[PDB]
Amino acid sequence: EQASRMNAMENASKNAGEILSKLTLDYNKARQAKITMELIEIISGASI
Amino acid sequence: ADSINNFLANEYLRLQSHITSRALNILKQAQAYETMNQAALLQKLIDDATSAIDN
Amino acid sequence: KANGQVSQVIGAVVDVQFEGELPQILNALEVQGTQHRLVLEVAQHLGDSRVRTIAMDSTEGLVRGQPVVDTGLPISVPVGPGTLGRIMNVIGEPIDQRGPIKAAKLYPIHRDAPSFTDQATSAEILVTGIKVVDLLAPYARGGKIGLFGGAGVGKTVLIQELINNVAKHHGGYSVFAGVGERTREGNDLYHEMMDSKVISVKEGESRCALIFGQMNEPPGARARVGLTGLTVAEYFRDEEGKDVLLFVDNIFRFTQACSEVSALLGRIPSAVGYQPTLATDLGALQERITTTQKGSITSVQAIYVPADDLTDPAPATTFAHLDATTVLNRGLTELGIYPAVDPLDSTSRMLDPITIGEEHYTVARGVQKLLQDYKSLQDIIAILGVDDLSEEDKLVVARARKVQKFLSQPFFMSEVFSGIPGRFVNLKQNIASFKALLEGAGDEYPESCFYMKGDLEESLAAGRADALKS
Amino acid sequence: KANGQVSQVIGAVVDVQFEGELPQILNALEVQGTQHRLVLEVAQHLGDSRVRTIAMDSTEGLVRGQPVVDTGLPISVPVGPGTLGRIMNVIGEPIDQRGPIKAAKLYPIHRDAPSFTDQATSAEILVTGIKVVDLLAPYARGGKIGLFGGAGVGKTVLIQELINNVAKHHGGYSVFAGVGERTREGNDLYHEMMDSKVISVKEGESRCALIFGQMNEPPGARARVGLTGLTVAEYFRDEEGKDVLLFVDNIFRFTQACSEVSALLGRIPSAVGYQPTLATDLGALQERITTTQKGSITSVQAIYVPADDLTDPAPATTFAHLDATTVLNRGLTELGIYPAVDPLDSTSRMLDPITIGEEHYTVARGVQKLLQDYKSLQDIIAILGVDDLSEEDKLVVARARKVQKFLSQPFFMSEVFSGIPGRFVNLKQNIASFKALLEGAGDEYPESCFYMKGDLEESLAAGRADALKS
Amino acid sequence: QEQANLIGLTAEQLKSIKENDVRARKEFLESQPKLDNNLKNIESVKKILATWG
Amino acid sequence: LSTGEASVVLAEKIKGITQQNDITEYGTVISIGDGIARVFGLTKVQAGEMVEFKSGIRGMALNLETDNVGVVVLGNDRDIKEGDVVKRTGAIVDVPIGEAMCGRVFDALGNPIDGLGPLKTTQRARVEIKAPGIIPRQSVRQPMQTGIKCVDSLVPIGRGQRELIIGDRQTGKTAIAIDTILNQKEAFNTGDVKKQLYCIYVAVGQKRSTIANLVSILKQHDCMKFTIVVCATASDAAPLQFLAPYSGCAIGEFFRDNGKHALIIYDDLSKQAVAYRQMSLLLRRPPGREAYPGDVFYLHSRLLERAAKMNDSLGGGSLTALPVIETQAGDVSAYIPTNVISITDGQIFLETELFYKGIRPAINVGLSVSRVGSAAQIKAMKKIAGNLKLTLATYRELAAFSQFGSDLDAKTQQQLNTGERLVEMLKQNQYTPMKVEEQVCIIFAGVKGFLDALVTSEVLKFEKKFLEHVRTNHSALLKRIRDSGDLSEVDTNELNTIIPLFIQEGGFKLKA
Ligand SMILES: Nc1ncnc2c1ncn2[C@@H]1O[C@H](COP(=O)(O)OP(=O)(O)OP(=O)(O)O)[C@@H](O)[C@H]1O
Ligand SMILES: Nc1ncnc2c1ncn2[C@@H]1O[C@H](COP(=O)(O)OP(=O)(O)O)[C@@H](O)[C@H]1O
Ligand SMILES: Nc1ncnc2c1ncn2[C@@H]1O[C@H](COP(=O)(O)OP(=O)(O)O)[C@@H](O)[C@H]1O
Ligand SMILES: [Mg+2]
Ligand SMILES: [Mg+2]
Ligand SMILES: [Mg+2]
Known about the structure:
The structure is cut from a larger assembly and holds 1 copy of chain A, 2 copies of chain B, 2 copies of chain C and 1 copy of chain F.
Chain A: H1 2-47
Chain B: H1 2-54
Chain F: H1 3-15, E1 26-33, E2 36-41, E3 49-52, E4 58-64, E5 69-74, E6 85-92, E7 94-97, E8 104-107, E9 123-126, H2 149-154, E10 163-168, H3 173-189, E11 198-204, H4 208-221, E12 227-232, H5 238-257, E13 261-266, H6 270-282, H7 296-304, E14 318-321, E15 324-327, H8 335-343, E16 346-349, H9 352-356, H10 379-404, H11 410-426, H12 436-447, H13 459-473, H14 475-483, H15 489-505
Parallel strand pairs in F: 8-12, 10-15, 10-16, 11-12, 11-13, 13-14
Antiparallel strand pairs in F: 1-2, 1-6, 2-5, 3-4, 3-6, 4-5, 7-9
Bound molecules: adenosine-5'-triphosphate, adenosine-5'-diphosphate (2 copies) and magnesium ion (3 copies).
Protein name (chain B): Transmembrane protein, putative
Family (chains C, D): Belongs to the ATPase alpha/beta chains family.
Binding site for Mg(2+) (chains C, D): 156, 181, 185
């Protein structure tokens, strides 16, 4: 039990880290798109 | 006895409601057609006026 | 004799062409020939005898070349006791249909804030009857109070309770300025104050003023109707040293209304589309709402948080001007606790061991730390549960839940929704009630009784009643 | 007469200066003194006898002041049985080197949508042979269909399958319109159409028309090529009256093309750069593709999802106009499931208990509910395996895998890619196949035997053989 | 003359009214009770239902 | 009235027809493009005033500039050319109102598109009018029965409030609106004017084929006799989509000011914002966040704020608004959805997950809320509605432990099962509205726990069989609940006794 439990937590923590890192990339990607969207709005209003 | 006595009683009212409803629907339904005939007759009068303008 | 004339009309912005003696900025201009009285506030001088103004009423029906009269002074509204118990418009018109408003004189809605040397700040506890508020975020008489809440969180109902609890039995007068909110709530509050005898038709009564800038009003009016209500409170403050209770509805509509016209005015949009003058426009209003040597104003203003995003520029800048803060959380409403006052985010400048009694300060932090610890345990409890926790942690979660549920308090304004009559809790009973729970006085009884109760004794009595019932 | 003169040339937008009698909007103008005749559609009257137009062909070689002739009518393309089996250009020119097209009349590509009085329901299911489609989002002939998918997800392959299963056996005429796509597919499609005997050079055959607006064309051409092909379809709908299969390749290019030229036309960009007339411009093109009392047009339109962002304004607004929807997911392609159809995102108006048999409705919801429940657990399944999962939930997960693998099937057109022969699944077999699978018929067999299978009985034969060898 | 001119009830127009009256009758008589379906299988009850009219 | 008398009045009316024509200023168009027409001269023109072009199409003068005038083409702008004449009519935009509007389909401007015949109406009201003040309003205390169990029980809608139907595409937003119109048909047949509710459906940016299918369903169920459909399709110009909401709203004010009750249903407003955004961008106005104009909030607020409950002094009329909002990916944090939520009173959140899991109507009770609350529900509903909310609240909590499993207390199993009966009970098919009194009976059996006996799969069919059994045998019970509107103790004992009895009578799976 303790042996299989330890191995399970290792695999679980491993998978938890991989997914957490993947979302971090999407978070940064979304961050760039957010700044891009807001910045264009300001330029569009400043143009007129 | 009381189950059939109450059945014929309530059934009698259902039959009475059926007749009065029938006698009322036929009258209202006939009135609906009567109004339609009147509107069609007057509509022809308006149709005659429009044709006179075209002529 | 009208000197100006309409030259350009686009949306709510209207330009007037003057021949000579242009009106100063913020001046009130009267357009002649309109079915309804239209007032234009001078905002910018574009040169060539041109001025850009914002319309307070619907611009539909205007015509280029329509004569415009210059009043020579900013929008002046009637002040004095005649406005008490009466609804007034942004330009001072009585929309209550009760007749003209009698005012000893007319004051302008634009004025300089009081100097710093004559600030005369003071701290005094305000027993509002709410235990969660009087304990964690005490209010100061004469200081600003902020109710940060999202869409449909219960900030409007909370304002009604404060009026029912604070406005009544108040020697001084009260002012209610509702800007940008729906008109349905205005009619309900008007009928509520009438039934509650807060306002009445008989003169010499109704020690409470009502101002409404509801959605039905167009832009510009919703951004200046708030100033109208403030002028009424300022009159009751300066002319008479009477404590004034200013109940301001959601104020985000003010900053929002300015952004609705900021684009047409020529300003470049901000990071979130707001006007570049957000800070200055808000600062001019906040600095005017403060206590002075003449009188004091206890302003209760609500801040609408769009999308529950506290990082928005408008509310973020408001935190700096508020003395007491009440941040409403949506999670509590899902749990059924009311008022849904966030105990951790909510803060109060009066929460100082030197200002308030040390015992009051101690019990306050004791609850904050208890709830903070319970929140961290939620993570491990989700996977392992409360059983796998230690005896020390179990007691933390046990008392934390009882304290969290005990914060819920039914008020008179919530009877229609819940069906339980409101209740008033004193400061002494409030501090003593929570102080006992921190020591484990109620750890024996179930956590179910510590829900929607006024005092700890009421919870214990309900606990015993449930026992004999089963 | 050459009353017009080129005023300025900017990319694909060209202005023309006329002396008098300006052409109406949408009128076609022909520039003189340039090989590869250029057509210009009137779009705006800038004033002072200046009109702004869009170029259909490359503008390189134009000189300011060059004369321009006014035709006085919009772009008129030939329509009729002559266009059948013939490739036309955005301006009606034949690009197949087959000679002049024989058309009775030339109809303008600009026409108003059918009125509200001339509209027909035509709620009849269209069996395409694809089990996943006929089950979740069954297509109905005479209605609008939309295929949403990203770059390289199986949109073209799916169109080819429908043409092989529906267009060939179809009785009435057909129209294929390519908008901003690789010309290679146009050539392969043309030769493939000839080989399959669907079209031939002999007169009286080739009950199908071909239109191409491939990427090689500049802006303005990809934005009006659809109107050209659509006009050929409206002719068969109204005049011929027979059914029509209007195959429309990726249409996002149309909306994109408008955006590429909107900036040049002086329009203010939209939220994310698109044109402000996206809704209206797209609507005029969408409202015309509808079934009326004269004839029915079953339109299969592909929608390219830019950057896999379904929230983009272009595809989002398209959903409101589509009857049947089939959203393609890239995640499925990675798993190897083809066709990569998302059952939870593929909506269809034809799915209702009254229109289709009640049994078909129950089996459809059974699969959707099964996959929906499994989708609600994929998160935890990723962190940790399904061993710790509850028994009832494990059964849902296990059976969900079987259904997911069974949805995939080989296509005849994609036989070269996978290397296995295609499969045509009848509607009765489709319903019966999933009915037995939901009941737990093939749960004992491995999920691999359901991968790329036509019918449920086929998977059992493979699954049973896999159990025999071991 | 307005009695008939105003309301010119044609033969078919009144015929439709008469059919509704008959339809109401057939519906009222032919309407049979709706009890437990698979339980009222007795030879007597089924005989009555057949000759319900 | 004799035929001769009516004909004479008809002829006399045609005789009294006046037609006066006065000098109307006209101007020339400096430029025309994308539906925007810059006009030279044409001074002394009012904002929003109606103008007519050469072809005969109308226009609205919105931008009044010192140099020119910005006019929007209210129709197809192909025939417009430079230098064309533009005649000002002298009247603000308006639309025809009256009772003849019912049973027809009009456009944004008000022209009938059904093709039956011309509109016979004499009253025309301005499209944009100031909303009622504070005094004319009145507290909402009348229920607006939609026919849905979950709505009429958890999210009661009172006549005079504003409820928001918010959800994603193909989440049942339109299904809810149709079910409401169908339910009001019964009240229209019976002679109860105090409960008649005229329905108004505003179609903005929708394919005509869908609206055609919509109208056919109403005629199928005979519910079109009291329905008004305003159509602003995608092919229609943006101003038409911008005015159609206010246009239909003015039609509702007719019934409102006349003491009547009207129900207006605004379709997706995001399409209006696009048309309003398009209309603003083409006018060269400075755009705001997300390219929308600065006063986009004032648009929906001005429109929705008109719906109110007029006091008895003006007739006691009421106008109920049911605006719809379409979300891209269920994100309610966007700009337009956030604003609309703050304007309306309550909002109905539709979830895509619940829809595919068999929960149709897919309603998220956790977020839905109504300001009126129990103030609108009937006595027999408030009592049962209160307990229903608490039971459903607990079930959502125990949902997680179901996965945990490995043990279940006796009470938790009951609460888990009991909640499952309610969820299965609130489900409802499409085009199947239920009467208010019938819902009280079914919703009653659920909270009491009687549904825990039979299997969940048999609860939905039990509803149909139970209601049918009640209508036939227990007819006096339904009459009392309807007339008195309260669930007396005598009805409770009778109802509490037959529900366990009926379950044993019918052939069901009693094994829980
Ligand atoms: N309560 C329901 N019961 C049974 N079927 C339903 C129900 N609701 C929707 N459906 C089905 O969903 C489809 C239409 O959904 P509906 O139009 O009602 O939602 P919507 O949000 O208005 O969609 P859209 O945003 O595209 O207009 C149909 O296939 C319909 O049969
Ligand atoms: N039914 C299919 N079965 C197996 N593989 C496929 C299938 N369809 C496509 N593939 C692969 O998906 C790829 C992309 O398909 P395609 O339709 O060309 O995307 P796009 O819309 O970008 O043109 C094809 O090159 C093909 O190799
Ligand atoms: N004390 C309360 N207890 C339980 N529910 C409440 C309570 N107060 C409000 N609700 C609910 O909150 C809703 C009103 O929210 P509201 O105060 O108007 O927010 P906002 O200030 O944004 O308008 C009502 O539906 C009402 O049923
Ligand atoms: Mg509020
Ligand atoms: Mg492709
Ligand atoms: Mg819909």
